[PDB]
Ligand SMILES: *[C@@H]1O[C@H](CO)[C@@H](O)[C@H](O)[C@H]1NC(C)=O
Ligand SMILES: *[C@@H]1O[C@H](CO)[C@@H](O)[C@H](O)[C@H]1NC(C)=O
């Protein structure tokens with residue numbers, strides 16, 4: 001989201017998600033422990049579009 | 050990673066200057082030593098992908 005309010009700042013995607021999880025009140029460790037599950041659910045949801 | 054445990058930052062991110070690791074806020078570079086007072090523990094050192102080895106400072110031991 002940084003490029004929408006200044007210069008673009010590179011970040012690892014998994015860390016980008018970690019920020020977005022904290023933003024909804026879910027501790028970031030949830031993402032890392034379940035990174036594979038989350039990526040898989042995402043891939044399925046997009047495929048069904 | 051420290052002592053087999055996974056330590057995450059309470060706020061900010063972990064960054065390396067090439068030789069040492071620090072924790073800093075996201076919107077302004079201002080590095081500080083990684084300690085037990087700015088991290089939290091959750092899960093072991095084997096569950097996180099991309100986890101690295103370091104030592105987390107404990108501010109209570111120097112007085113014991
Ligand atoms: C990283 O910071 C430490 C502490 O200031 C310093 O001793 C070290 O030389 C720095 N490393 C590099 C590559 O600048
Ligand atoms: C980062 O990406 C490279 C490929 O450019 C890969 O070899 C490496 O294992 C990846 N590291 C992590 C932690 O994903």
Ligand SMILES: *[C@@H]1O[C@H](CO)[C@@H](O)[C@H](O)[C@H]1NC(C)=O
Pocket residue numbers: 050100101102
């Ligand atoms: C950390 O060090 C241990 C040995 O104490 C090693 O088995 C482990 O693979 C290392 N982990 C990383 C991320 O370097």
